[PDB]
């Protein structure tokens, strides 16, 4: 039994081969080390330390080389020598990380055997063309009916989701994939999302409880968990998105899509500060590196939509940035607002006014305007967005304790309803066939009939009287997934039949 | 100075030392280029550190290098092609096509250091340009010549307003733009190349009225720097040698701002204040000087910037402020509003606003309607805290003509039948100082707000009365 | 008499936020100074980080 | 290991070593230098190269002659544990400090431990209750939970933490330890007091507490590595004997404030803020030493002192995303005479759900939440106008929200003394009953002295009738 194992293992292990390099180490802790010598060493290239431990290596010298420990340093000791592996850093792909938790280098944490792999892919790739893309139409949904209905979320795209830490930033990010299992289970690969969730700087029990999650709605069986726990070593959470966006890209070459969570961005960014000091180099602006837009950057411009002499596939990308008791315009949190194209930013007040999942619709935006809203919700929605920024001026007004007239006071009457309509639980799945019913009867103001602590009671029950009877109605939006002439009137007519209540 | 050949000795990511052999070396401005398996790297040669040891800034991708490859001296410096036959084609750093149409087309060939035009060349501007956009027409007029800035801040519509400029006005001339794209998204990129192959304005049969340098987020920050630099020397050629005045755009202007502040840093330079650069000034001043009126041509920059969260006490967009005769701010709110242009027209300020330039009567138009106005905006603190009080009728014919104003500031746009499905319309600059004269004399005091909504002239004004009546 | 009243209530209230309003505007410009002042000392931290490597 | 050296230089608590033997040293190693206080142990964290090492001094560093020889002990020091550490106050380096001499063991381990894999891991979700009312509805604790305190120190954190002592440990009865980072003498003294008389510490037998104490007097290296000795006593109690333990400590941000300033010293250039670049692989380290195995789970609450009382610092900072939950305690609501101070709006657990710790205590910590934070928003409106001219619908809210503000408090049974009220103790059960109670309107009609300095709904009523006469 023991006996075997450890029989297998001396023979699996000893006996190298004659040496073309070396260098004797010198400094040496902190997880950080410099040698001396070393002259074939490449940039990016893995050194494997004789004491177990294997760096990369990000800095050369004609004097000291500056290798950078992953193992514990513990294990290191100064006159070793080290030995170039003579290959730049690379992780296996293939479709056997699926149901799983893999680290930062890509092998299995959580116990679940070794690893299916069809090929081997780099986490440096790089974006592909302006000629190899195609322009993103891809409708996708978070199961969040505020967020789909107020900023377009596309297949291809990043959208940089913002805010306090702890506010429930990872949590925003789980009723997205949970929300995917309805897309996942549907016949065709060419809906099929595979979702990699990054997990930076993190502890071990958080990423513990989320699998838990995850299997319990049974959502666990194309999902990938990416780990670089906040223990383990600053090259190794440096290295955690690079690797995910690898095993991203083997979906997007094989025309199937994806999506890619990076909670949290800001996190690696305090990694790469303690590594660049450590190689006593100057920072950036507040101790920051001076190449960390360079990271955030590349990384992001790799989930991206294909064109049709290619997979036709897309990586979508979320970015999660965590400002530390706010701070929107620190030197991390700037950096990433610039590279996406999108945010949908979470504020922390709104959450104790019972406003979850929490958005503020100013400071979230979109500059090339809606385009990747399913076509029906965009009908429904359309005058959401005009009402709703204009109650927020009309409220300011209201509460004084002034005199109002009739006009002032429908935009309250009607942004009140409105709001309220948006509140859903979290860790709760939704469909686009779902929330057509529900935009309608707010914009075309039959919540105002309905008093404002029923407007919650209202909904559960709207969407149930039509699986009784305006089933017809549902089924033509699902099909469809747009509002013709003869749907206004049938829906129009199914608001009315069931106000009450 | 020379063909030499001298070994890496340090890899500091972009940062790449070389010490070339004793007596020899290259002279400050160079390129260099080294083999490496990915493209040819050029190193830009920034600094002399004695012994013969020069201190580089990378422009391509940096990965597997080996302390001791062998480095060459073009002998000159990063030389990029120019020529009416690039109008079309895409240019990067190092002068290659991404949307691989292979090797540039040259007639000419050019280096991206070309010290500024001097003040015996000057020559005083007095074309008007027309952008045929009401509320820039008459509340910030440009005139063609000049250095005209986009000051908005983060997503603020600043693509589709290029998107509408670029659309409309390069046809409409027989001059020539060239639009450069400064570190900005492989998303935009794509959408910008589609969508103006569509209408006719960038075409593979005959010669593009707008050509096109795309260097983007992906490459380096060395890479991205001197992109801008790349669109430039294009202009020039445009300028000088074919004599044909030049519509030029640059996009976002802060990447090149934020890319020369990053490597000032890694080169080990002392940063100045709130993290920016200490040769702040003299890099933005390069670009602008360059960008002049002379009497070979002129070249007239459309300038994006970003401005972190609407704030300009930070001093990288402050500074910025000088350059640009012919501000206009894109702010956040208006374009939430249902109104399209994003333009805040009383936050926007031309120093091409005269009397006789634009003659009287543009200027005591638009006058008015500054006022008009802000005395609307002045009052919503007073219907906010007093209520009903304090007021006059005087006031609320005021708040009346303000609001049928405000809702005659949008001008649906050709390039937002993607955002609403809303299609253009051109308003000539005589036009609008018209249109908006009768409204002000209060001839049309008696046509609802939304009856002047997504108009252009005066005849659409009575249309949709017309339509709100049946 | 209603209306006297009226008015006078009303002249009473807004007397009284002049003065409610002048303490909580110098209790911001205390808080505002030394916001500012703490900001140039924050700047100065981050130029010692950069010239000590 | 026989390598021997001399010390080349003595720069505060951060020696240097130089070492005349060309046999190599390894870095967490041990360095004794014979000192006349007796020794002077040591702990290599750098090798310079050239073999001269750079070592942490734990102890004094009055007497250290420059040239002075040294052993090379060859590793990391090894603390004693065991069940014999059970009524016994140890040193960083094992000493005792209550003076019932050498500390008795059967296992003597390092200090360092390497943090548990994904595969150990395993869950909760577990209802643990300290009986505090605004900590029970708000920001539910659990078995095997991380639970973390913010907000400055001489305010009642002392207090606070005896009390959490004095409900959570005779509620369990079990293993426990308390390890003191950075702790103030003249308290530590109260806690020993305070201990024996509660029953806790027993030395005619067996106490259910260990204990580590390191005091804030003591050099910078010994106050960094105070947490992990304590550590090591907790991890004994999780895997050898296979139980739940405790852990309070107060406060934790000294293990962050020492590590800040060897770091200079070092070789390190130190982040913005002061603050080490390492506090994050620190970090990292200890909050997953302390986590729920398929063995134990340490059950802990920490104490954070904070600087300016500012959480905008990045090393209060760093530590959220580590912990399960957080009750953030603020001075100014300290000094209003309201205890817990415990901010209402400024909690979150991520146990508070409405199915973890059910429905009931979901809608009314929801209402809470909503009823004070709409009363926050208008407070600048509510002083500098009145409080009829104010919009009506909102005067029921401001009413509400002002009779919770009072409620809020529950005297302690540790400080009973000096509040000047009889410590109170109610069940999660009681809490949901009395929030429940105040949100229905049943009791609200009655003065706001009434809710003031008293725990549940019942207490209330009690005082109308004390005010009466």
């Given amino acids: ?501 | 100075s020379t063909p030499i050949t001298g070994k890496v000795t340090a890899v500091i990511g972009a940062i790449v030392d070389v010490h070339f052999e004793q007596s020899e070396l290259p002279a400050i401005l160079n390129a260099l280029e080294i083999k490496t398996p990915q493209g040819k790297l050029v190193l830009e040669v920034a600094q002399h550190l004695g012994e013969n040891t020069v201190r580089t800034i990378a422009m391509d991708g940096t990965e597997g290098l080996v302390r001791g490859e062998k480095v060459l001296d073009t002998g000159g410096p990063i030389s990029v092609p120019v020529g009416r036959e690039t109008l079309g084609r895409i240019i990067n750093v190092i002068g290659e096509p991404i949307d691989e149409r292979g090797p540039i087309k040259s007639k000419l060939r050019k280096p991206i250091h070309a010290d500024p035009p001097s003040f015996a060349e000057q020559s005083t501007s007095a074309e008007i340009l027309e952008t045929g956009i009401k509320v820039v027409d008459l509340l910030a007029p440009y005139a063609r010549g000049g250095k005209i800035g986009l000051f908005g801040g983060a997503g603020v519509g600043k693509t589709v307003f290029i998107q509408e400029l670029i659309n409309n006005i390069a046809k409409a001339h027989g001059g020539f733009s060239v639009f450069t794209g400064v570190g900005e998204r492989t998303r935009e990129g794509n959408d910008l190349y589609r969508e103006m192959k569509e209408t006719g304005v960038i075409n593979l049969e005959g010669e593009s009225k707008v050509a096109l340098v795309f260097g983007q987020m992906n490459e380096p920050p060395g890479a991205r720097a001197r992109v801008a630099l790349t669109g430039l020397t294009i202009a020039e050629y445009f300028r000088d040698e074919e004599g044909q005045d030049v519509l030029l755009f640059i996009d976002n202007i802060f990447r090149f701002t934020q890319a020369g502040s990053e490597v000032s840093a890694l080169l080990g330079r002392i940063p100045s204040a709130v993290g920016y650069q200490p040769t702040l000034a003299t890099d933005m001043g390069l670009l602008q000087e360059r960008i002049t009126t002379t009497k070979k041509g002129s070249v007239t920059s459309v300038q994006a910037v970003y401005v972190p969260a609407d704030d300009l006490t930070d001093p990288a967009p402050a500074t910025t402020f000088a350059h640009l005769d012919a501000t206009t701010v894109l702010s956040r709110g208006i374009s939430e509003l249902g109104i399209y242009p994003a333009v805040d027209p009383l936050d926007s300020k031309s120093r091409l606003l005269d009397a006789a330039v634009v003659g009287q009567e543009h200027y005591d138009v638009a006058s008015k309607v500054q006022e008009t106005l802000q005395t609307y905006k002045s009052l919503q603190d007073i219907i906010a805290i007093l209520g009903m009080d304090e007021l006059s009728e005087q006031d609320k014919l005021t708040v009346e003509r303000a609001r049928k104003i405000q809702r005659f500031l949008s001008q649906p746009f050709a390039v937002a039948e993607v955002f609403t499905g809303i299609p253009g319309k051109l308003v000539r600059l005589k036009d609008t100082v018209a249109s908006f004269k009768a409204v002000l004399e209060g001839k049309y005091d008696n046509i609802p707000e939304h009856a002047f909504y997504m108009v252009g002239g005066i005849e659409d004004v009575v249309a949709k009365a017309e339509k709100l009546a049946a | 008499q209603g209306y006297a009243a009226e008015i006078s209530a009303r002249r009473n209230a807004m007397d009284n936020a002049s003065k409610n309003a002048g303490d909580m505007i110098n209790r911001y410009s205390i808080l505002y100074n030394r916001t500012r002042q703490a900001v140039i000392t924050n700047e100065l931290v981050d130029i010692i980080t950069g010239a000590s490597s």
């Avoid at chain 1, 935009?411 to 409105?418: A, I, K, M, S, W």
């Fill in chain 1, 1 to 501: 039994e023991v006996s075997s194992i450890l029989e297998e293992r001396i023979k699996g292990v000893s006996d190298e081969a004659n040496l073309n390099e070396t260098g004797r180490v010198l400094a040496v802790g902190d997880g950080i080390a410099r040698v001396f010598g070393l002259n074939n060493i490449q940039a990016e290239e893995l050194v494997e330390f004789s004491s177990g431990v294997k760096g990369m290596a990000l800095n050369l010298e004609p004097g000291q080389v500056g290798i950078v420990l992953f193992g514990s340093d513990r294990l290191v000791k100064e006159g070793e020598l080290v030995k170039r592996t003579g290959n730049i850093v690379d992780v296996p792909v293939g479709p056997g990380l699926l149901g799983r938790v893999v680290d930062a280098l890509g092998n299995p944490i959580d116990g679940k055997g070794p690893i299916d792999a069809a090929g081997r892919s780099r986490a440096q790739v790089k974006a592909p063309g302006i000629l190899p893309r195609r322009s993103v139409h891809e409708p996708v949904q978070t199961g969040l009916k505020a967020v789909d209905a107020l900023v377009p979320i596309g297949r291809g795209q990043r959208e940089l989701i913002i805010g306090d830490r702890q506010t429930g930033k990872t949590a925003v990010a789980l009723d997205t994939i949970l929300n995917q299992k309805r897309w996942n289970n549907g016949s065709d690969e060419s809906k099929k999302l595979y979702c990699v969730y990054v997990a930076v700087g993190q502890k071990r029990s958080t990423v513990a409880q989320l699998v838990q999650t995850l299997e319990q709605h049974d959502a666990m069986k194309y999902s990938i968990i990416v780990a670089a726990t906040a223990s383990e070593a600053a090259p190794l959470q440096y290295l955690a998105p690079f690797t995910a966006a690898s095993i991203g890209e083997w979906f997007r070459d094989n025309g199937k899509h994806a999506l890619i969570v990076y909670d949290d961005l800001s996190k690696q960014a305090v990694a790469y500060r303690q590594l660049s000091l450590l190689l006593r180099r100057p920072p950036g602006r507040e101790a920051y590196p001076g190449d960390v837009f360079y990271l955030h950057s590349r990384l992001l411009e790799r989930a991206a939509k294909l064109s049709e002499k290619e997979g036709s596939g897309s990586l979508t990308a979320l970015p999660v940035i965590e400002t530390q008791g706010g701070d929107v315009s620190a030197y991390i949190p700037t950096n990433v607002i610039s590279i996406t194209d999108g945010q949908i930013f979470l504020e922390a007040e709104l959450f104790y006014k019972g406003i979850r999942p929490a958005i503020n619709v100013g400071l979230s935006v979109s500059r090339v305007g809606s385009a990747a809203q399913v076509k029906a919700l965009k009908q429904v929605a359309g005058s959401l967005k005009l009402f709703l920024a204009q109650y927020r001026e009309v409220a300011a007004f209201a509460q004084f304790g002034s005199d109002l007239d009739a006009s002032t006071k429908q935009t309250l009457v009607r942004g009140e309803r409105l709001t309220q309509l948006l509140k859903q639980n979290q860790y709760s799945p939704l469909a686009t066939e779902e929330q057509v019913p529900l935009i309608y009867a707010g914009v075309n103001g039959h919540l105002d009939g309905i008093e404002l602590s029923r407007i919650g009671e209202f909904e559960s029950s709207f969407l149930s009287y039509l699986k009784s009877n305006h089933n017809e109605l549902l089924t033509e939006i699902r099909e469809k997934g747009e509002l013709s002439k003869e749907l206004l009137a049938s829906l129009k007519s199914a608001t009315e039949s069931f106000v009450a209540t």
